[PDB]
């Protein structure tokens, strides 16, 4: 019912956006908690969260299908 996907990107350190953490239900809520604790942007994107969850594992860099949408997610998150 509830998904959260945590992406990490730092220029010159992560070659691509990295899914560092994922969570469903209780752990999804925890992540969206902890993201508010540390002031990390949370964006609701149902199709992107669901496809990332189904395709990209924890600890895995995003694949080619996700480059454009995650680029846009990150730009939107940047400011905010």
């Amino acid at each position: 019912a509830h998904i959260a996907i945590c992406l990490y990107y730092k220029l010159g350190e992560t070659p691509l956006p990295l899914v560092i953490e994922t969570g469903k239900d209780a752990k999804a809520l925890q992540i969206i908690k902890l993201a508010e604790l540390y002031d990390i942007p949370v964006i609701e994107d149902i199709p992107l969260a669901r496809s990332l969850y189904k395709n990209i594992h924890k600890g895995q860099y995003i694949t080619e299908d996700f480059f454009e949408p995650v680029a846009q997610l990150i730009r939107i998150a940047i400011d905010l």
Partner: peptide
């Protein structure tokens, strides 16, 4: 070919360095 950076720390710390969280 799949690409991983599989070792990492705690749930709290991973989030604190995170860039964006996407949810449904």
């Amino acid at each position: 070919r799949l690409h991983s950076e599989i070792q990492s720390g705690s749930l709290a710390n991973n989030i604190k360095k995170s860039t964006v969280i996407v949810k449904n």
